[PDB]
Ligand binder design. Structure first.
Ligand code: NI
Length: 341
């Protein structure tokens, strides 16, 4: 059954709760973003109202084939009413179309659900600043002090300079970027922009990008692999074997590959700065691991929560074992004692 952390008290609303069949009492199902863990169970066969951003609605319509009658897209930064209750959707700084939701309960309680998010100080000057928030449902993916990572902009600058140098040294080199879902689009679009190229990709991936309301998208992407010097491939193919194989496929139009695997955290975040990063190399193929994160680091999460000062925190990630829950509660108490709420 639907866990308490996916329910919003004093409404019949749920959030990211599609895998449990009909939820007893639920009149509206919110979807924070289009990642399969969160949407799991949604398909053309679902027949209840789904509330979400415009981008998330385009994906539901076109990729999942959910019937249009059940999609209720809502604009951002706008006070709306859903089944008698005031809500606001905010940018989560996660993947395209990802939202946090602010719920103003009839009793006067205010609840923020972050969805998946990468906390940022720009969130301190949104509609959140205008009133007290009593309860916070928090993306706790990286809630431990070992999880540090560079800013998105440091990582993109590194990727840009790296790609530019390599293709100026060898104008017959191909750049490959790995991908599995939506998110991290800036990696491949920034590389392409410094090389004066479109990004080539499969028909399924092009269809996905065409849903995302990216300005001038038709000038940036193509399904003609031949005509482009930055290609997208599935993350699974980003290895020496998969990359040599793809290089055979391109018809001797390129004689070298430089590939990027955008990952989350891995253990080498604890020493190495982005400037020290060096690739793995085998012959004419080089692979760079770059920690481009769309979740809060420990310090980013801690700052946001210390600013917000919630009366209660409900974790939404890593809640499946008591050891994890216990560890997270410890950090929440530390943050509260330090900041005086
Ligand atoms: Ni996500």
């Amino acid at each position: 059954t639907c866990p308490f952390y996916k329910k919003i008290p004093g409404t019949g609303f749920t959030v990211d709760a599609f895998q449990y069949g009909v939820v007893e009492g639920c009149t509206a199902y919110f979807l924070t973003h289009f990642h399969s863990d969160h949407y799991a169970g949604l398909s053309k066969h679902f027949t209840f109202p789904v509330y979400c951003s415009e981008i998330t609605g385009n994906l539901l319509k076109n990729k999942l084939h959910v019937q249009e009658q059940y999609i209720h897209p809502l604009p951002l930064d706008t006070e709306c009413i859903v089944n008698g209750v005031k809500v606001v959707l905010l940018d989560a700084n996660h993947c395209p179309g990802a939202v946090m939701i602010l719920f103003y309960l009839p009793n006067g309680t205010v609840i923020l659900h972050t969805g998946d998010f990468r906390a940022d100080p720009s969130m301190e000057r949104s509609l959140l600043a205008d009133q007290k928030v009593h309860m916070l449902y928090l993306d706790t993916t990286y809630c431990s002090p070992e999880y540090t990572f560079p800013s998105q902009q440091e990582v993109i600058r590194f990727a840009i300079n790296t790609a530019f140098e390599a293709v100026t040294l060898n104008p017959h080199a191909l750049v490959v970027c790995g991908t599995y879902s939506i998110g991290k689009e800036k990696v491949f679009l920034a590389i392409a922009d410094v090389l004066g190229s479109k990004v080539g990709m499969s028909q399924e991936k092009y269809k996905t990008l065409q849903c995302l309301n990216i300005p001038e998208i038709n000038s940036l992407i193509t399904t003609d692999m031949c005509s482009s010097l930055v290609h997208l491939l599935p993350m699974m193919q980003i290895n020496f074997k998969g990359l040599q194989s793809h290089l055979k496929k391109c018809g001797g139009k390129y004689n070298q590959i430089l590939a990027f695997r955008p990952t989350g955290w891995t253990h080498s975040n604890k020493f190495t700065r982005i400037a020290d990063v060096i690739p793995q190399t085998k012959g004419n193929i080089s692979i760079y691991g770059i920690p481009y994160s769309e979740h809060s680091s420990y310090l980013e999460m801690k700052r946001f929560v210390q600013w917000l000062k919630p009366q209660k925190i409900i974790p939404t990630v890593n809640v499946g074992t008591w050891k994890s829950r216990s560890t997270m509660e410890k950090y929440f108490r530390e943050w509260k004692l330090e900041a005086g709420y």
